[PDB]
Design a protein around this ligand. Sequence first.
Ligand SMILES: [Co+2]
Length: 69
Amino acid sequence: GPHMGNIMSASFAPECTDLKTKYDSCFNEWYSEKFLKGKSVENECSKQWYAYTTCVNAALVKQGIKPAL
Ligand SMILES: [Co+2]
């Protein structure tokens, strides 16, 4: 069934939770279309992936646990 989100990650970067939900949903929809239905479709979710990933990276850098440059 559905695999829940990470509580520690959400607690560390709550401002990224909605972006994560949107990315996970996009990816699941894409995977269903291509690998469950076997339909040759465009790659998807690059934008949703970027939004979430950048949000997480920004949080790590802001808290001083990831270098900026
Ligand atoms: Co499952």
